[PDB]
Amino acid sequence: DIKYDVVIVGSGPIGCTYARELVGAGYKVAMFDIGEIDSGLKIGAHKKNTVEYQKNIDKFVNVIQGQLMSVSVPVNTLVVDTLSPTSWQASTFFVRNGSNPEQDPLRNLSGQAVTRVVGGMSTAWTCATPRFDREQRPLLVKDDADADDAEWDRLYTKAESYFQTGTDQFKESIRHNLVLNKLTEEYKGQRDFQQIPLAATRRSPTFVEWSSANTVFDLQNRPNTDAPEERFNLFPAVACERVVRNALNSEIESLHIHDLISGDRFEIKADVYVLTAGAVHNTQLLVNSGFGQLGRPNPANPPELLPSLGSYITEQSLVFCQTVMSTELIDSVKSDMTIRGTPGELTYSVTYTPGASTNKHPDWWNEKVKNHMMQHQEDPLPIPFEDPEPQVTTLFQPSHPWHTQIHRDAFSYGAVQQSIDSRLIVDWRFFGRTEPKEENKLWFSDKITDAYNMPQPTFDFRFPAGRTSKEAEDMMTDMCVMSAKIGGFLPGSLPQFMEPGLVLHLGGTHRMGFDEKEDNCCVNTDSRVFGFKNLFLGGCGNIPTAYGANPTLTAMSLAIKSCEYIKQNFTPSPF
Amino acid sequence: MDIKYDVVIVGSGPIGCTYARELVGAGYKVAMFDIGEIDSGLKIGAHKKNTVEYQKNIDKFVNVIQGQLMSVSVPVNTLVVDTLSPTSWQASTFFVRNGSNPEQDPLRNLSGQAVTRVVGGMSTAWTCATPRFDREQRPLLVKDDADADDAEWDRLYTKAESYFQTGTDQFKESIRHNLVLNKLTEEYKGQRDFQQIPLAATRRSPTFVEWSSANTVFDLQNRPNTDAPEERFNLFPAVACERVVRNALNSEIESLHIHDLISGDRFEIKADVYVLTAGAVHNTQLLVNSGFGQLGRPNPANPPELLPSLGSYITEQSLVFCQTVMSTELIDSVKSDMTIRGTPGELTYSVTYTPGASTNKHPDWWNEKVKNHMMQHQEDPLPIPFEDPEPQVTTLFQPSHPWHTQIHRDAFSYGAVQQSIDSRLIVDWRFFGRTEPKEENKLWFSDKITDAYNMPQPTFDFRFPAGRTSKEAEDMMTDMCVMSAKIGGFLPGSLPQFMEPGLVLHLGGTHRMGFDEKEDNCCVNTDSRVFGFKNLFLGGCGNIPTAYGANPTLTAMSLAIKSCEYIKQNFTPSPF
Amino acid sequence: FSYGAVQQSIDSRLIVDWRFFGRTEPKEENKLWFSDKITDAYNMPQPTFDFRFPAGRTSKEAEDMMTDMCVMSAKIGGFLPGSLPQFMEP
Amino acid sequence: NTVEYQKNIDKFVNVIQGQLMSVSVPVNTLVVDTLSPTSWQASTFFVRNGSNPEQDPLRNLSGQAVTRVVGGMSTAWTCATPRFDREQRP
Ligand SMILES: Cc1cc2nc3c(=O)[nH]c(=O)nc-3n(C[C@H](O)[C@H](O)[C@H](O)COP(=O)(O)OP(=O)(O)OC[C@H]3O[C@@H](n4cnc5c(N)ncnc54)[C@H](O)[C@@H]3O)c2cc1C
Ligand SMILES: Cc1cc2nc3c(=O)[nH]c(=O)nc-3n(C[C@H](O)[C@H](O)[C@H](O)COP(=O)(O)OP(=O)(O)OC[C@H]3O[C@@H](n4cnc5c(N)ncnc54)[C@H](O)[C@@H]3O)c2cc1C
Ligand SMILES: Cc1cc2nc3c(=O)[nH]c(=O)nc-3n(C[C@H](O)[C@H](O)[C@H](O)COP(=O)(O)OP(=O)(O)OC[C@H]3O[C@@H](n4cnc5c(N)ncnc54)[C@H](O)[C@@H]3O)c2cc1C
């Protein structure tokens, strides 16, 4: 079709929030994604939701790695001086293999990467959806903190519903409670610990249905039996390239796409254009469309439109280690048990007294330990083989201004090993907040292009001196101190800062504020691009503040608010 | 789910899809079970590399393969970690941990062997090479009449090739492909012939190849449907097939016991015909879990009741691998027909050729692509266009070089990524040796240890046989070193090496075919029917009883087609 | 020698080293010169190399010498993993 | 020529590496981007640690090194003393 009420670029969780809202409200919606349906019969669903992946969670790191394509790889300068004399040998470090010659390797976010599949990165994410407290969060209401808090509560509540956020899906994990209780005790009165809030529904003791874009909106074309009055079409393998501005710069007139299967290019018309292509690619599509400044920043000629586009970018510092559980904590697991005799032998019985007030642990815990120690008497640990992973956090606070995850999950790194029993291993990830600075930028080459023939992204980024840097190092030390209470570092996973941007929490590339000039921003609190009646941006690129927590829930909340504007200001076509 | 089908197939890989395609088409009521799930988009069982993104970022596809390959038998780990904090819990022994197999001798393993549980099986990830076996590598379907035998294999392979859409033309306009092909052709001339690797694939565009898969064989859609209103097929993903039930006389299978992994329910499914296409390892597992062969560590003093050759005479290929960096001479040859004046990057620079000159070394299409690359990309120091498709060259197995060869680029489990050398220069070398079948080389199943699906844990007892297998394997290494030198020197970091045993994933002979159970030490006859059993058939590389170097799937498909011929001759489809 | 990072898994009695040494044609353009600004640890002009193996005979032989080591070494044994055939740093 | 080295011959490599000082090390351009943000961090690949900025890393003899001990490299060498045939000889 040539004409829609709304077109949405990208099928990640944020595009899906606009689809859920606007498709539900009766709009003829088209959604385009440059990537394809892979994921199974549930379009855009979490790839970790297969029996095989949940039996072999360490293999999922491979899936993640296989769909994270680096944003900007500087030109390689490794010296290979052991080629055969007959082999063709370089005289210079020329531009090879997709590298970016615009990129200073020392001012990069080398770990930054993007995913191009239907459902975006929600096909592989780790589902942590905390709310930001005031300190981390931009204002949606000026001069009324209580009204501002109320608005965010209303939006986050809906967002949590859409993602199926919960804080009890790991409540009966031994490892989770083990870690939770010890940290709760150690910081008693000083910090609070809880389960990471997770966009997930537990289906069985050994299976968790992790949420994804599909959870937000199932991405099935409509009308269909289950929604005969709704109108939605998803078009995968369509690279969206430009929004066409009118000469007056007050309205978008079309979206120019490239159908990657036929190879043909089309102009799609809509009343309302929503860009939810991610924090990098939203900015890319805007710059390729005449917003901001194409090429190396040049203050001499400021751009015509959106001069803050691609400036004030933030990415979080991330420190990481893994620990091996202390003897003391492992011994405490079986503290309630009565242990008759010698394991393997007839004289082995393991029993406990349900409800005994002297017991350190609940009955659900002892029953599982007992059963494990009795079913597996050769095994030297008291933790059940199927015990779900820990999922503990102490949330960002002024006296510890970083987000924390004390957990086990699959990421692009954490290349786990086989010599140490996995039941012993806990991951530590602390996330710092980065002050937004005009000098930190994502820009796009006016000569170099990427694999889809669009302007090559280039970072110019350093963690700002002052608070960001002081905090990041204070965060490291906090991780070293806190993790030492649970066990010592796992060799091969010693405490370290991760490559800039590997954390994938980039924000502020197309930031939100109330006033374009005063707040140095690109979209207002309805996520509308300043000056344009019908152009909206969604995603973490909107977030203008220094945040430690995981941003997606916050980007979703902004999107819900955006949709309220859209619904108030545009009327659906007749069906 | 019904209680009753005409045919049930275990496994939705390309071999199971061969039985589905034949049997569904002939009007049988078919059910197919796979323990894994739908994972390749809307085209069920399709090749996961058929995305625009993967074909633009082909190095990334290694991670997909690695993510779905689950190792078969991992010996207990004895790595010393002695720098734990004194507070951390520490083992006193190297105990059974993290899924490891205490049965497995680490020194007599196929440590690289791995399986994939996804609908479409390993054909969601494979490299699509589908050569025929020559007589030397191939089991006999007709004894004492080599022309009847040749005629039967030709008919079956031709059919197999249509199902896979095998061809040898998809890479014909690649400059790198032709550069290597013509060089090796000239250098060997009259000693070895070279051609494109036969590939199960159809090119869609200059930048995209639709790799074939199980889906290409059979689309895996439930039937009847608008397209196939008179066919009957249901696929049931996430169902672990556990045992076939023998009647008391051991002359028939009475049902298949399944475990639906989502609901946890268990059922006994009844069919006229039972087909096991669960792969070389898992077919054997299922059969042993059903009282065929011998459960547990082999014990010759307790000879099995049934199928004594089951899981013996296993073969797996020796694999040697390197990469090379293209010679300066060959790179200069790419631009042999060009006239180049001025200095690159200046407006006086030009690159031209004489179209049609019979003294041109290359054809016009080549020279135009070089011209355009050099004129539009004057900062680039190489003459090869950026999106030039990869080489896909082979000289097939012959008695004077008894190994298969691939001189190509592809995504495999071990395709480690380097960025210092331009990828246009890099060619992969994979030479694959044939392994003599020997009784002592075994896949067996623990009577104590179980796998992730609570089935008997697979254990290998394998070494490459002394004598011809070993001699060839090493002569194969040398051949790779000699041939490859003609194209370029090795790429540091990919020096010539034997790969981990079983990484190549060409295991055969676990349930091997022969004419006579005893005399040929085998488990199925040439209809792929299990000896003694009217209605049990095995399909897959497990059937192949010979020493082969070439990639085995086409051959197993051809056997599967023959097997279906017997089925159609002996079982009537139920009326619609 | 300076290279050879020790291994213990394979019995040393089995291990044999192969070192083949090529001859390099003398070319005027292959140079050792000394900086007029940078100095070394004893305050003398810093040595600098400008060197490549000459194309032509020197390169062709070096690669044929590689192939010859692979061919000859195979008569004695296969390569030790971790000491696979390689050109050493110039 | 110590009983200890000839009983532990793999350890002699370390003696060799210990006295071979590289002749020309080009300026280092390894990217270390996981420093703490509070650590002093370079804006350029400047001349560090004895490196030679005259040296093109791609036209070097990077393995060339010298020994500054009495007896020179003969304190470490492998003692192979073949004659040159005519072809190799001035
Ligand atoms: C391993 C991993 C772990 C993470 N875990 C956490 C976590 O626990 N919590 C947290 O909040 N976040 C986490 N994240 C980040 C989270 O996934 C993102 O913040 C979120 O997915 C962003 O949603 P989005 O819809 O804005 O964009 P994306 O999910 O990036 O999706 C946008 C999409 O647009 C498409 N697209 C891009 N360019 C174009 C174009 N030009 N034309 C058409 N389509 C286009 C894509 O193909 C893609 O599907 C994780 C990410 C990964 C990779
Ligand atoms: C990276 C890669 C490259 C390869 N390249 C080539 C090549 O170029 N040429 C070629 O000839 N071969 C190659 N192969 C090997 C080829 O993929 C296999 O030979 C082929 O897939 C075997 O087909 P099959 O149907 O017998 O088995 P599989 O493809 O292994 O399918 C068997 C299936 O049965 C299932 N299953 C297993 N156990 C059970 C059970 N108990 N219950 C129910 N279902 C079960 C699985 O989940 C699976 O889908 C390669 C393989 C890989 C992974
Ligand atoms: C591990 C090893 C293996 C080798 N194996 C072989 C082999 O088996 N066969 C063989 O032919 N070659 C071998 N060599 C090379 C051989 O060692 C040299 O060719 C030989 O030592 C050169 O002798 P020379 O006296 O000219 O120089 P050197 O041995 O280099 O001695 C020169 C000396 O002069 C000194 N010097 C340098 N500058 C000054 C200065 N400005 N003022 C005062 N003194 C100065 C030194 O400190 C030094 O002792 C080997 C070398 C090494 C290190």
Author numbering:
A (entry chain B): 44 to 618
B (entry chain A): 43 to 618
C (entry chain C): 454 to 543
D (entry chain C): 92 to 181
What does the literature reporting this entry say, word for word?
In this context, Trametes multicolor pyranose 2-oxidase (TmP2O; EC 1.1.3.10; for a review, see) is of interest since it can oxidize both β-D-Glc and β-D-Gal to the corresponding 2-keto sugars, which are intermediates for production of D-fructose and D-tagatose. TmP2O is a homotetrameric enzyme produced by lignocellulolytic fungi and has been assigned a role in lignin degradation. The reaction catalyzed by TmP2O is of the ping-pong type involving a reductive and an oxidative half-reaction. Therefore, to evaluate and compare the productive and competing sugar-binding modes for oxidation of Glc and Gal, we used crystal-structure analysis of 2- and 3-fluorinated Glc and Gal derivatives bound to the TmP2O variants H167A, V546C, H450G and H450G/V546C.
